[PDB]
Amino acid sequence: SKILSTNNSNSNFVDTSFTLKVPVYSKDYRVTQDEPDEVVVANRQQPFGVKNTARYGIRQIADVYRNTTIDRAYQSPSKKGTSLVVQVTETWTVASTDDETYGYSLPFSAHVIVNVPQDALITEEILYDALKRLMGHFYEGNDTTSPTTTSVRLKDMLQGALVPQSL
Amino acid sequence: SKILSTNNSNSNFVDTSFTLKVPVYSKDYRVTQDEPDEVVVANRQQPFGVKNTARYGIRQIADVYRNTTIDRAYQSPSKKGTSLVVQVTETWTVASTDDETYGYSLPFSAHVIVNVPQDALITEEILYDALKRLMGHFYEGNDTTSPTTTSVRLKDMLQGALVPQSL
Amino acid sequence: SKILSTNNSNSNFVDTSFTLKVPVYSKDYRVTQDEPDEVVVANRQQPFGVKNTARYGIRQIADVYRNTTIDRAYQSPSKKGTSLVVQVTETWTVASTDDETYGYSLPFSAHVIVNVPQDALITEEILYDALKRLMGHFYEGNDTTSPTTTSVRLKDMLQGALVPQSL
Amino acid sequence: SKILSTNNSNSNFVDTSFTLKVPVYSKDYRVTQDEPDEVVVANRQQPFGVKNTARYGIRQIADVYRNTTIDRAYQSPSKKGTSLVVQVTETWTVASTDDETYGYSLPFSAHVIVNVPQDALITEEILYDALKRLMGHFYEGNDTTSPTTTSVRLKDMLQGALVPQSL
Amino acid sequence: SKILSTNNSNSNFVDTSFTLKVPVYSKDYRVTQDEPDEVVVANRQQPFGVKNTARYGIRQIADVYRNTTIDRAYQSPSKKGTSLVVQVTETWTVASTDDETYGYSLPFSAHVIVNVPQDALITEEILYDALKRLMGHFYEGNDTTSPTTTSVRLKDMLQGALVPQSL
Amino acid sequence: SKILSTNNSNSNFVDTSFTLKVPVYSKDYRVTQDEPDEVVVANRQQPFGVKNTARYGIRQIADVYRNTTIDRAYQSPSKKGTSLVVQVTETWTVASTDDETYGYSLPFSAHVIVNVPQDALITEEILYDALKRLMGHFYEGNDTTSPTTTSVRLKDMLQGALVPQSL
Numbered sequence A, B, C, D, E, F: 001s002k003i004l005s006t007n008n009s010n011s012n013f014v015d016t017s018f019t020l021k022v023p024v025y026s027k028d029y030r031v032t033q034d035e036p037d038e039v040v041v042a043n044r045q046q047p048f049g050v051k052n053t054a055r056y057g058i059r060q061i062a063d064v065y066r067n068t069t070i071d072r073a074y075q076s077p078s079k080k081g082t083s084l085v086v087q088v089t090e091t092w093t094v095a096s097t098d099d100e101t102y103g104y105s106l107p108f109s110a111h112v113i114v115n116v117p118q119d120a121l122i123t124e125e126i127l128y129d130a131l132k133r134l135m136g137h138f139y140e141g142n143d144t145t146s147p148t149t150t151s152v153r154l155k156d157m158l159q160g161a162l163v164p165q166s167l
């Protein structure tokens, strides 16, 4: 019997709540692009100025070890991978309570990329928990406190402070 | 008076729990690279075979309106932007309880990229809630049920079913 | 025993109050850049539009006598110096009480440079008192009055009147 | 109605005394250079060996928004600016009470540069208080103590400890 | 399961105390060179004449078996290794009580190099215990006496007595 | 009279315990090579596969000031020095509980080099204290806490975190 380990058992994390607002695609979204490797989905609820779209794509990874330093002797026979991308694009607007003529539009976009080796032992739950570990790096954990606590670092990183405060 | 709207007020969502594992950087992580716009951080807790790193980087965006279908209204403060990347790199290991000889290492990686315009009305909370909307696209929601239900997408997407099954 | 003199004992000065607002770095500032000779520190308290940063840097001076006219016979054996720079960068905003849509941002910056020879006899107090003499040149002293008084010349200098009024 | 804010209202500071020695230019200083944008002034009181000068200069700034991350909103009065420099140059002397032969001269110099945009709402007092905030960065402050306490930085910075010890 | 043995189980030692003076880098040191493979650190508290420095470097070892007697049939699958160097450089001064003009500076340098194969089973504790055994060779052990005793050997080796007394 | 100072009087350290396992050469070792400059010693108690060796060598240093920043006016009259090397070579074995046929041998090597000027004032105790300071750099010191504490740094450096946490 073969067993896969993520080797995160010895890491120190703090749970924190991150409540997702999941779309209702049937109500809100229509399909803009259905190419075999790339789908694009548009938000029908928006006015013409405001563009709200999502993009879901996969690419095949020739050599999953290509940029890693894992010794040849420890590489899987199957070296193929899959690369997933999930992009969301939003259009925000700025206006004034006092002046109905003041306004402009700001474009926001953000995406997630996930590079998964093609191996039978990797499961959907393993990958979601990987995503949870990933998104957890937008915070800093504090086990010093008696109830374990977390603090936000997204603004700090955006401002150029990329090293955590814990170091 | 001045108000920024994300124009999500007419989108239909469903909440779901996504509990993040935030790192205790003080225990686990040390700095491999401290250059001004790119920081690399390594996980002290892994053994020598396993490589576990995180990378935090920003890039300055020249014109946030350039690739978009949005363009700049006359009273916009700036075209400038900032692009943030957060990457995690893990080394998973497959072994066998039958054969001590049999084993290999799988490389996992994933990252998030966020493209924030330079407008002071964008707040840290606005950005986190944007990230929550983003990660929501790894799921599908149902308004119909009395407790709202969410199903998962990550498998179906990685398998090539890039259109939501709700559509 | 060796003694250093600044030779300012024969100069005529007027004390005047110049009350410094010193930062609380722990509360307000995070680190943007930690290069060995140049550190940059950002003000976390500001909104995204407003940039508030400080820069602290040192350069080594090859020949401290390079541009001076001190005779060779009176030069120290050790000709190395240190050049310190302290820059502050602020973003000011202009708005209207009456019109909540009227606004713009102004960039302010200013720095101090201090070129100190590497000599054991120069002390931290000597250098601070040098800085006090330096900043005192933004004023004009008046010993003619019975209580000695001072007047401001920053605007006059900015407007092109670089000679003091006392001459 | 029109109000300029320096946006320091949410920064945390601590006051400290910094008593300036303002020159009595009429007694001590005479003009070496009177060219329109650069004035050099020499200290009459020094002996022939010791050189003590001050230099006051302005340069016109073409676009005050050019090197900055700020850029000009549509209702800004001008891009123009003025850059002021104030330099002091001193000649310190080391001698020995044992040997009449032993002596040398150390050259000290330091200057301040101020980059003021052309907006009429910037006042002379705004600029002086900016200078006070600037010089405050040669210190570190503590909100904690009941009389606020400030420690010094100039030594630690010149020695290469460019990050505040509070951080 | 897999087990590593250092094969020191049956070798005979005598413990002796060797109390390390560990640096407080935050108070005493600054970074001179920040390279990915080689960091250089310097003591900013020393006076100018006395340069106290340290150097921390890693080279990567291509074949850890290159200069060993281990036949290939007994080698691991992975030949990778890393090589660590820790160098310290001090400057001592000799002077006189009776004569202020008499003195000179002596340079001391020393370094450690450690050549660790990349095997997950090599632990940080294993490596430190190896270092302790290494430094034990600067001594000679006697377990025949009622209290186990050790005599120092550094000066003897420096003076050409390289073979231990016991041999 | 003449006095040597290591100038470590004002530097800040934290003591930590490092108990050396000193060899009993009479029981465990034999001499492999007896040269005037290089002695090689081997563990005769190890089984045949496991080679445990040590090497003790001295080279003579022509100019101890060759790669130093010490100007000639500050050098001793004698440039002679000696250079000591102490190398240890071990062979660790990896095997399995479940499988008698599974195993391999890992080579460990490490050495120390010490570069001592020939000055009568350098004592054996001075040199051992220097070695203790050297090995202290494998740790990081914290004297702020109520008990002075130290954390290990060997694995962190091996893994590319070469700059101390404190810096």
Ligand SMILES: [Ca+2]
Residues within 6 Å of the ligand: B034, B035, C035, C036, E034
């Ligand atoms: Ca660097």
Ligand SMILES: [Ca+2]
Residues within 6 Å of the ligand: D034, D035
């Ligand atoms: Ca003229």
